[PDB]
Design a protein around this ligand. Structure first.
Ligand SMILES: N[C@@H](Cc1c[nH]c2ccccc12)C(=O)O
Ligand SMILES: N[C@@H](Cc1c[nH]c2ccccc12)C(=O)O
Ligand SMILES: [Mg+2]
Ligand SMILES: [Mg+2]
Ligand SMILES: [Mg+2]
Ligand SMILES: [Mg+2]
Ligand SMILES: [Mg+2]
Ligand SMILES: [Mg+2]
Ligand SMILES: [Mg+2]
Ligand SMILES: [Mg+2]
Ligand SMILES: [Mg+2]
Ligand SMILES: [Mg+2]
Ligand SMILES: [Mg+2]
Ligand SMILES: [Mg+2]
Ligand SMILES: [Mg+2]
Ligand SMILES: [Mg+2]
Ligand SMILES: [Mg+2]
Ligand SMILES: [Mg+2]
Ligand SMILES: [Mg+2]
Ligand SMILES: [Mg+2]
Ligand SMILES: [Mg+2]
Ligand SMILES: [Mg+2]
Ligand SMILES: [Mg+2]
Ligand SMILES: [Mg+2]
Ligand SMILES: [Mg+2]
Ligand SMILES: [Mg+2]
Ligand SMILES: [Mg+2]
Ligand SMILES: [Mg+2]
Ligand SMILES: [Mg+2]
Lengths: 201, 20, 64, 143, 117
RNA sequence: CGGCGAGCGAACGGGGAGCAGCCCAGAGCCUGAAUCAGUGUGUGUGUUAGUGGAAGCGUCUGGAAAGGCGCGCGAUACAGGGUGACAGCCCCGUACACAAAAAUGCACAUGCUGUGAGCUCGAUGAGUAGGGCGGGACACGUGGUAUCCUGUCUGAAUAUGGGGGGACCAUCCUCCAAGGCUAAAUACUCCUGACUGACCGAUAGUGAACCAGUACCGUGAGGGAAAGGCGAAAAGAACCCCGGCGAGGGGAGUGAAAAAGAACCUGAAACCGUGUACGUACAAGCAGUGGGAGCACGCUUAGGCGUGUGACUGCGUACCUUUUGUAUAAUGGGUCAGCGACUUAUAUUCUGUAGCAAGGUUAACCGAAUAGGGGAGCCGAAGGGAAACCGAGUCUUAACUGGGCGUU
RNA sequence: GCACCGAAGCUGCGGCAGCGACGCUUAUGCGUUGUUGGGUAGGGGAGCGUUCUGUAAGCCUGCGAAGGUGUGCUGUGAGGCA
């Protein structure tokens, strides 16, 4: 598997198993969903009858008044105070096997090439911490929406793009599944490629 | 209104034993 | 919380190879002298829990 | 492309809801039937219970006795030992190859098939069929 | 996620009251009452779609009959004729002609009489 | 462990977080020497006010531009709020860079007080251990019951000594009770600050979005409500008319809107009227449904067509529940609106589906924090037997022609 | 003894759906064609709509969003569109 190195046409040579494999939709869909879950925090309200504020006095006699039975003023059937199955803060984190996570990234990369949404480059960096610079580089490179996975990550490339909305920059380890799919184009330095090459084995 | 006090008795009361 | 094994049953059944259960026969613990040797003899070797009771035993021994 | 993914067909069964109307199929009664202990919140009877009748796991006698020595004896497949790392399959060593478990103090070798690399087994026990297979593969079985 | 409910509710309710338009008193005002009125109307209809075909046939047969008698022959004989009148098949409604074209009818009666001779 | 019922439920060992060790039972010399606290000072660092902080205009619709369209500009600042509709460039901020006269938290550094350091030679926790009786604790219900605590009565040895190794004895091994101190990993949030949410949005959410623990109820403890929205801006209606120098209303005027007029956004439903069409005073019942004229209205060019009504007519005893069975004179509902009932967590098993495959997978935890590390461990690849043990067999028996469970 | 009336039974015409086979043709769907489709407890299958997250700094919207009230169309229905 060779990849057109874009700028200095050179070819990079990458693993066919990690860049030329068939797209396993289901398997990715499990991981992307999983990642979207676990984005979640718990943080949730609602007072069971056990925790609404009132005494536990029976509102009125069992029998005698022409009234429905009635037992606790906190009853879910009654008005103020209730909630039959009040929620609690909860954890939505899923598992995702090691081999399934990796399995998904591969199906994702190996699809980004197939739509040449992945353009790999020898070196990528901006010359100063100024957004306008980066805005221009992208302009010149014909890009708006981009992931740009740098090799080791530098100060200036990060501070630019902090304010460009459709563009983010991550180091090699920072690669997550939604992002790969999120942006219209993933850049990635040829240096990063080798990192990823191994991370996925 | 102010209008809000109901102390409804117990049935009301008189009679009934209805053969046993 | 983990299910608790119905401890009494644990002490009367053992999961076998194919997933059966085997038990000791009843009727062999006292008042013996009046029972045929043939009968008592047949009550020594363990035996499989029947198809009908499998449901019960399993529900008693989730960790069998 | 983040709204073009979809799960494998029949990987996400909807799951009974019940109690929501005639059409649903599980309305009103909610598949619980009419009356009795088994309907009703928190209904049901405990495991093993079979009406007040003396339960199976009580009609039948206990016959236990737990070896406790057995708990510290492992069994070894021929398929192992090749993976022991060092051609000497020792009292532990297997232990280090994570095929026994620390607490173990005894071990048989068992004809569970397939040994190739010559290996010498030391301080273990070994079945008639296993010894033969080891030896016939250039192995040695010293006590 | 708490569900407002109640916008869809009046949708369901008004969906029914609309069907109850015309009914007397509560039957057209009060949902609880209307939902019943609406159902049973449906029930009768489903029934009366089958009744309709009964009612009209005996309507037809009734007037087929007078016209037959008018031309001096009972319905009994008269259908038997047309049956026997060398096969030949013809709706009891289409004997419509009994009201709008009485010569054509009498003409049909004769053809029937002949087969019975 | 256990009316061996219901249930209760360890430890050994292993992977991790954090790791730390010291005094008294004392006298001699040397003496205030380590150290700790309390305290004054100093310093640094946080805190309790603060400062600076980029860049937008044209035009269209409109009551109003932040909106559309055009063309510029800042961005280490596109977090967020506001402004007459949705604003990176109007405002307040944000990133970023800065600031403390004073008082303080925290570290060190010392001053003052109190305190002891150090070397030599000593000392080594008795009404205690153990036992008897009664209870209580240990997962352990007295059980074959070690071990721990003690209300009661007792009562040692003292290093050649003593404790423990789950009755108990021997041997072995291992520890030193009957004095204390000790940081971190652990728990919690009345309250302070900042930030977040597949959390609620006025019958929800705190009981309380509102001057609510109020009004109210109760001798008292104590119980305990209802009730949010004019508009962009009050511009909150000068003046005139009816009326009782009224209530209420009609004009006028403000406004995009007054049908937004304060009983004020939206303004549903029950419920009550005015107006019009059609039916209805010889007719009997779940009130509709199938048929169906007439009338009023639209049609169409007619053409037994749409809408509304519905003479007359066939059929026709509501719903729920509960029941062998209900028009039932058996239950429940006066009506509307809003709310109101199979959830959540952890285990276990089955189905589907996905990964990998004789292997599969990690837990805590580390963390460049959904990655990567971590295989402690769990499931499976071998079964049989109560068990020792044997092993593709094994158990049964002296032994199987065998048989039981297993080997595909 | 021959008529005839009479049911949601049989037949006829049109339509839907499951299971069959046969022919057109197989990431199937057609055309036939035989057959099946009352239903409480209850088991199985497939769906509508509501709230909220992403997709979405997109898209619709003061040239009128949500809600309310009519009307037309559409689906087997929960509904949908205008
Ligand atoms: N008449 C009373 C019955 C009754 C009889 N004795 C009473 C004493 C107290 C109250 C009620 C009663 C009723 O309507 O139910
Ligand atoms: N049972 C009697 C007397 C009576 C009246 N009220 C009562 C209440 C309770 C007991 C009895 C009564 C009657 O009704 O004529
Ligand atoms: Mg109480
Ligand atoms: Mg009542
Ligand atoms: Mg509440
Ligand atoms: Mg991981
Ligand atoms: Mg015995
Ligand atoms: Mg019931
Ligand atoms: Mg019953
Ligand atoms: Mg039942
Ligand atoms: Mg191991
Ligand atoms: Mg018929
Ligand atoms: Mg400022
Ligand atoms: Mg500014
Ligand atoms: Mg001591
Ligand atoms: Mg202490
Ligand atoms: Mg409230
Ligand atoms: Mg409201
Ligand atoms: Mg209003
Ligand atoms: Mg009349
Ligand atoms: Mg009458
Ligand atoms: Mg009559
Ligand atoms: Mg009865
Ligand atoms: Mg019944
Ligand atoms: Mg009946
Ligand atoms: Mg009646
Ligand atoms: Mg009744
Ligand atoms: Mg039916
Ligand atoms: Mg909405």
């Amino acid at each position: 598997m060779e990849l057109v190195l874009k700028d200095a046409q050179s070819a990079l040579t990458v693993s066919e198993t990690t860049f030329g494999r068939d797209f396993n939709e289901a398997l990715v869909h499990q991981v992307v969903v999983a990642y979207a879950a676990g984005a979640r925090q718990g943080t949730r309200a609602q007072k069971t009858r056990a925790e609404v504020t009132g005494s536990g006095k029976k509102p009125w006699r069992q029998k005698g008044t022409g009234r429905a039975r009635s037992g606790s003023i906190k009853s879910p059937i009654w008005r103020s105070g209730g909630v039959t199955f009040a929620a609690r803060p909860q954890d939505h984190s899923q598992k995702v096997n090691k081999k399934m996570y990796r399995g998904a990234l591969k199906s994702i990369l190996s699809e980004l090439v197939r739509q040449d949404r992945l353009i790999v480059v020898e070196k990528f960096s901006v010359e100063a911490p100024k957004t306008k610079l980066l805005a221009q580089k992208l302009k010149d490179m014909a890009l708006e929406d981009v992931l740009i996975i740098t090799g080791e990550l530098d100060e200036n490339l990060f501070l630019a793009a902090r304010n460009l909305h459709k563009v983010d920059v991550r180091d090699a380890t920072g690669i997550d599944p939604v992002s790969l799919i999120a942006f219209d184009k993933v850049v990635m330095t040829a240096d990063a490629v080798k990192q990823v090459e191994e991370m996925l084995a | 209104h102010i209008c809000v006090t109901s102390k409804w008795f117990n049935i009301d009361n008189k009679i009934v034993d209805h053969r046993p | 919380p983990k299910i608790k094994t119905v401890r009494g049953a644990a002490k009367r059944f053992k999961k076998t190879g194919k997933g059966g259960f085997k038990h000791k026969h009843a009727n062999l613990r006292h008042i013996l002298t009046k029972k045929a040797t043939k009968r008592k003899r047949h009550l020594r070797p363990k035996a499989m829990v029947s198809k009908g009771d499998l449901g019960l035993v399993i529900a008693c021994l989730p960790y069998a | 492309r983040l709204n073009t993914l979809s799960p494998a067909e029949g990987s996400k069964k909807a799951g009974k809801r019940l109690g929501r109307g005639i059409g649903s199929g599980l309305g009103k009664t909610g598949g619980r039937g009419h009356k009795g202990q088994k309907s009703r919140s928190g209904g049901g009877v405990r495991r093993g219970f079979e009406g007040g009748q003396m339960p199976l796991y009580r009609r039948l006698p206990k016959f236990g006795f737990t070896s406790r020595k057995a708990a510290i004896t492992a069994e070894i497949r021929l398929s192992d030992l090749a993976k022991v790392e060092g051609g000497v399959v020792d009292l532990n060593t297997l232990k280090a190859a994570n095929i026994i478990g620390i607490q173990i103090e005894f071990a048989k070798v068992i004809l569970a098939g397939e040994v190739t690399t010559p290996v010498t087994v030391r301080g273990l026990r070994v079945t008639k069929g296993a010894r033969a297979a080891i030896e016939a593969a250039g192995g040695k079985i010293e006590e | 996620a708490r569900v407002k409910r109640g916008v869809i509710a009046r949708a369901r309710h008004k969906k029914i009251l609309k069907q109850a338009k015309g009914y007397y008193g509560a039957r057209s005002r009060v949902y609880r009452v209307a939902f019943q009125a609406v159902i049973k109307a449906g029930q009768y209809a489903y029934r009366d779609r089958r009744q309709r075909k009964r009612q009209f046939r005996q309507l037809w047969i009734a007037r087929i009959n007078a016209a037959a008698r008018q031309n001096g022959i009972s319905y009994s004989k008269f259908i038997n004729g047309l049956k026997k009148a060398s096969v030949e098949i013809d709706r009891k409604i289409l004997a419509d002609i009994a009201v709008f074209d009485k010569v054509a009818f009498t003409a049909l009666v004769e053809k029937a009489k002949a087969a019975l001779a």
